[PDB]
Design a binder for this molecule. Structure first.
Ligand SMILES: [Zn+2]
Length: 257
C-alpha cells in the first residue's frame, strides 16, 4: 500500500494510479514571475461562520479535521469558482524539519507545512460524485512557516496525543477554521488534482500568497504523530508531502499584482 517511504512513496504511486503521470497533477511549483495577474479574478469568499466541525481522524497519512457537510454551512465561492463548494475536511502536510513539508512551492521555496481545506461542488450532490468531475473540488492551500504561534491552531495540536496512530479518531466539535486563515486572501489558482491517491484530476487549486506563522512547538507536535497503527513499529508521521509535479500545459493565475 501507498505511503511516503522508500518503497511506497510518491515515486511509486503511478503503478497503482497511472493518473500520477497525468496532464493536471498537483502540487506544482509556483513561479511567481510567470504567474499571470488576471484582473478578471474575483475576491475569494470564505464563509465559515456556521462551520460545524465534528471529529479528527488519523487516517495513516495525515489527520483530517472533519466537518458536517450535510448543508451549506461552511462554503467557498468566488475567486476563480463558478458555484458553491462545501467544506468537508482540512488537513496538513509537513516535514521532518522546518525546511520542507509543503506540497506547493513558491519559486522553489519549500515551507514547513501546508494546510489544505477541501471543498466539494454542491452541484454534484456528494463528495464521491464530485471527485469524478473536472470542477468537482476547490482546495484552499495555506502555507505554514515557523515563528510565532498560531493561537487558533492550538486546539488542533493538543488533541493530537489522542489520535497518535492510524485509525484513531476523537470528537472535535466547535473548532473554528477561521483561526487558521492569514490576513490576506490574495491567491494563485490553477487546475490540478488531489495530492494523494487516487490523484484524481478534479481540483481547482486556490493557494494563498500569505503564509500563516506557527510555532516550532506546534509543528513539533505534528511530528509526534504516527503513520502506523497502535502497537506496530513506530514510524513518525513526517514528510507526508508529494513533491512538485510537471506543470504541462497549464497556466497559474494571480489574483494580485
Ligand atoms: Zn492535502
Amino acid at each position: 500500500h501507498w505511503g511516503y517511504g522508500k518503497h511506497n512513496g510518491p515515486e511509486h504511486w503511478h503503478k497503482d494510479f497511472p493518473i500520477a503521470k497525468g496532464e493536471r497533477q498537483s502540487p506544482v511549483d509556483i513561479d511567481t514571475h510567470t504567474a499571470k495577474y488576471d484582473p478578471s479574478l474575483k475576491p475569494l469568499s470564505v464563509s465559515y461562520d456556521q462551520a460545524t466541525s465534528l471529529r479528527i481522524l488519523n487516517n495513516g497519512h495525515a489527520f483530517n479535521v472533519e466537518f458536517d457537510d450535510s448543508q451549506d454551512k461552511a462554503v467557498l465561492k468566488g475567486g476563480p469558482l463558478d458555484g458553491t463548494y462545501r467544506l468537508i475536511q482540512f488537513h496538513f502536510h509537513w516535514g521532518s524539519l522546518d525546511g520542507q513539508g509543503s506540497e506547493h512551492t513558491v519559486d522553489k521555496k519549500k515551507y514547513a507545512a501546508e494546510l489544505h481545506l477541501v471543498h466539494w461542488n454542491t452541484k454534484y450532490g456528494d463528495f464521491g460524485k464530485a471527485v469524478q468531475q473536472p470542477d468537482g473540488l476547490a482546495v484552499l492551500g495555506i502555507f505554514l512557516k515557523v515563528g510565532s504561534a498560531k493561537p487558533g491552531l492550538q486546539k488542533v495540536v493538543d488533541v493530537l496525543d489522542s489520535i497518535k496512530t492510524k485509525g484513531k479518531s476523537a470528537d472535535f466539535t466547535n473548532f473554528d477554521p477561521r483561526g487558521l486563515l492569514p490576513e490576506s486572501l490574495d491567491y494563485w489558482t490553477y487546475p490540478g488534482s488531489l495530492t494523494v491517491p487516487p490523484l484524481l484530476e478534479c481540483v481547482t487549486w486556490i493557494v494563498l500568497k500569505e503564509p500563516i506563522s506557527v510555532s516550532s512547538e506546534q509543528v513539533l507536535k505534528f511530528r509526534k504523530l504516527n503513520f502506523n497503527g497502535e502497537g506496530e513499529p513506530e514510524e513518525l508521521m513526517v514528510d507526508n508531502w508529494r513533491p512538485a509535479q510537471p506543470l504541462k500545459n497549464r497556466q497559474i493565475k494571480a489574483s494580485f499584482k
